[PDB]
Amino acid sequence: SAGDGVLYYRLTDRYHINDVVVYEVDNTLKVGRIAAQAGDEVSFTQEGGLLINGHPPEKEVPYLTYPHSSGPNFPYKVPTGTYFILNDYREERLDSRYYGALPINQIKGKISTLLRVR
Amino acid sequence: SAGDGVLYYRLTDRYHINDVVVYEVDNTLKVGRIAAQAGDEVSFTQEGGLLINGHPPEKEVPYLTYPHSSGPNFPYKVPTGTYFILNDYREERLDSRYYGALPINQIKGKISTLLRVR
Numbered sequence: 281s282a283g284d285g286v287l288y289y290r291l292t293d294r295y296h297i298n299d300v301v302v303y304e305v306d307n308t309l310k311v312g313r314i315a316a317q318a319g320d321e322v323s324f325t326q327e328g329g330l331l332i333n334g335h336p337p338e339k340e341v342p343y344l345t346y347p348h349s350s351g352p353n354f355p356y357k358v359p360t361g362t363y364f365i366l367n368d369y370r371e372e373r374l375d376s377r378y379y380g381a382l383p384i385n386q387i388k389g390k391i392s393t394l395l396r397v398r
Numbered sequence: 399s400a401g402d403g404v405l406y407y408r409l410t411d412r413y414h415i416n417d418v419v420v421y422e423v424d425n426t427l428k429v430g431r432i433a434a435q436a437g438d439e440v441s442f443t444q445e446g447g448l449l450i451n452g453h454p455p456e457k458e459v460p461y462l463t464y465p466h467s468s469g470p471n472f473p474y475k476v477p478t479g480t481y482f483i484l485n486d487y488r489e490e491r492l493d494s495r496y497y498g499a500l501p502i503n504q505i506k507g508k509i510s511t512l513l514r515v516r
Contacts, residue, residue, distance in 0.1 A: 282416065283413075283414025283416045283417050284416065285418075287509060288510060288511040289512055289514045290511055290514070291515070294515060295515065296399060296400060297400045297401060299403070300403075302509075307490050309429040309487070310427060311506075367426075369425050371425065388512065388514070389513055390514070391405060391509055391512065391513075392405070392511070393407065393511070394506065394507025394508060394509065395408050395410040396407045396409060396506070396508070397410060397411070397412060397413065
């Protein structure tokens with residue numbers, strides 16, 4: 281039946297690494313995770329491993345991560361006030377691997393919970 | 399600082415028209431709204447108006463809605479067990495206007511609240 285169509289907001293102080301966000305690139309609203317923040321250096325191994333400040337993150341064990349051929353040069357320094365976003369399905373490479381890190385106005389908010397039909 | 403990276407789920411009985419969902423098309427996680435459900439007929443006016451079962455929905459007043467040239471034929475009958483999804487920025491036309499209505503396995507869940515930095 282008809283819902284009221286009201287998406288609520290809750291104000292928060294800051295985002296965290298690993299948060300699931302709604303992000304906007306090319307006027308497209310997508311979902312991904314914050315992988316790095318201002319000042320971080322993002323790099324790749326040839327074996328598909330993400331490196332952040334020269335360390336392989338513990339939470340990156342599950343992911344096989346390849347660059348986009350037209351994205352930024354790497355190693356990549358995340359600018360002030362921006363967030364480096366990665367899709368959890370890493371073979372959809374049109375995240376910060378193509379766009380670079382995103383300014384905060386392009387982060388629409390964090391998803392803490394999804395409601396889901398069984 | 400580092401968050402725990404846990405997205406929670408809450409089980410719900412069903413989705414509603416106008417709900418904001420995370421949806422998957424071409425292995426891409428996107429955000430849009432449920433605009434129509436199984437059995438509904440979706441049509442367009444030339445002036446950019448969505449019609450659902452031959453009525454212009456009250457909540458469609460704000461939206462200027464054009465077809466994708468390679469999407470389904472319209473009028474379009476929403477199949478059993480599927481959801482017709484529209485992006486709120488309607489000029490990003492790669493929603494059900496291109497893909498058709500989506501089966502439930504391609505609806506990842508409903509967003510009720512976003513957490514957002516001021």
